[PDB]
């Protein structure tokens, strides 16, 4: 294809997505930095009720080096998250992910996703609660606020769009519990007829 990806090349972006995500690329496609590559669907209220809490949280997903296991943590910003945690950070089992040590890491591995979100709690008229985690990118502070009424089926947040952070060739992987897009840098191959 004139340009190829070496089997030794590691991805320049590895995007982790919900299993409901709509992919806008396919295996082997070349993309340019800034191209649309995926969209997560809008977030809708499952039941009518009133918003009783809106809280800043950090979602952190950790994966073992062999990729056999992952854990996902939703940690309140108030528990204290070190500013040095980012994608690629190496973590160890038994060490705290929060300053107050209430959240402990359960795997040796690396952080593969870390994102600021708003935890939104809706309480139904008969006293049940639903919990939503809304990415900051699609959070609207005028509509999602304590005391606001929501109705079954109402959109709480728009679909979230994802654009390539780098140019290269796409690999898509589909698991039961998530989708990923990896983008790899390519190398020019020798003109061979």
From Swiss-Prot:
Keyword Lipid metabolism among UniProt keywords: no
Record-given protein name: Transcription termination/antitermination protein NusG
Keywords: Transcription, Transcription antitermination, Transcription regulation, Transcription termination
Residue window of the full protein shown: 41 to 233 of 353
Key word Transcription present: yes
Task performed by this protein: Participates in transcription elongation, termination and antitermination.
Record family assignment: Belongs to the NusG family.
Gene name of the encoded protein: nusG
GO annotations of cellular component type: cytosol
Natural source organism: Thermotoga maritima (strain ATCC 43589 / DSM 3109 / JCM 10099 / NBRC 100826 / MSB8)
Lineage summary: Bacteria, Thermotogati, Thermotogota, Thermotogae, Thermotogales
Domain comment quoted from the record: The N-terminal domain interacts with RNAP and the C-terminal domain binds either to Rho or to RpsJ (NusE). Contains an additional, species-specific domain inserted into the N-terminal domain. The N-terminal and C-terminal domains can interact and form a closed conformation.
């Amino acid at each position: 294809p004139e340009e190829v990806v070496l089997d030794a090349t590691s991805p320049s972006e590895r995007l982790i997505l919900s299993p409901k995500a709509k992919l806008h690329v396919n295996n082997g496609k070349d993309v340019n930095k800034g191209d649309l590559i995926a969209e997560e669907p809008p977030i809708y209220a499952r039941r009518s009720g009133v918003i009783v809490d809106v809280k800043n949280v950090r979602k952190i997903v950790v994966e073992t080096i062999d990729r056999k296991y992952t854990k996902t943590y939703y940690i309140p910003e108030s528990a204290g998250i070190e500013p040095g945690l980012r994608v690629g950070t190496k973590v160890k089992q038994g060490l705290p992910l929060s300053k107050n040590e209430e959240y402990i890491c359960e795997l040796d591995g690396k952080i593969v996703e870390i994102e600021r979100m708003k935890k939104v709690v809706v309480q139904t008229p008969d006293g049940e609660q639903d919990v939503y985690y809304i990415p900051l990118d699609v959070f609207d502070r005028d509509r999602i606020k304590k005391g606001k009424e929501v109705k079954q089926g109402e959109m709480l947040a728009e679909a979230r769009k994802f654009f390539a952070k780098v140019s290269g060739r796409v690999e898509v992987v589909d698991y039961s519990t998530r989708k990923e897009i990896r983008i790899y840098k390519t190398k020019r191959r020798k003109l061979f007829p």
